[PDB]
Design a protein around this ligand. Structure first.
Ligand code: 7ZB
Length: 124
């Protein structure tokens, strides 16, 4: 089975809006979402549909851009670092599960390069 997806809305977790988190949603998430290579990263890895029975034995901190979109939209994060950590966790999961030069890794690396370029322009 797949696990349930990561939590995206927590009534008990405090919320706030910052210009960095607005940038992470309206610039960073939006730009990566529209990238040609984004499709494997737009939702949790469906290990059932993809026949990857070891995926969630190896990856115990799953992350994906559909979850990050929901966390941003729901004001789930208190600070930008929490959202940047989620993007980094998602790329790292892909790297750990696969091998250098695999198609999925080249795709993740291109998205990560674009992510880092956008993060360099994160406002104050
Ligand atoms: C035929 C084919 C070929 C390719 C390149 C992609 C897909 N679709 C697809 N969808 C979702 C997840 C993956 C995937 C990930 C992965 C993606 C996001 C995160 Br976060 C973490 C890991 N790691 C490997 N894979 C594939 C690699 C090739 N087949 C076995 C599974 N792949 C399908």
């Amino acid at each position: 089975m797949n696990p349930p997806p990561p939590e995206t809305s927590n009534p008990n977790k405090p919320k706030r809006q910052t210009n960095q988190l607005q940038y992470l949603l309206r610039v960073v998430l939006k730009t990566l979402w529209k990238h040609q290579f984004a499709w494997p990263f737009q939702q949790p890895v469906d290990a059932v549909k993809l026949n990857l029975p070891d995926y969630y034995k190896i990856i115990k901190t799953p992350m994906d851009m559909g979850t990050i979109k929901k966390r941003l939209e729901n004001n789930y994060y208190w600070n930008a670092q929490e959202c940047i950590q989620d993007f980094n966790t998602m790329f790292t999961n892909c790297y750990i599960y696969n091998k250098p030069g695999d198609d999925i890794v080249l795709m993740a690396e291109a998205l990560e390069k674009l992510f880092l370029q956008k993060i360099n322009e994160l406002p104050t």
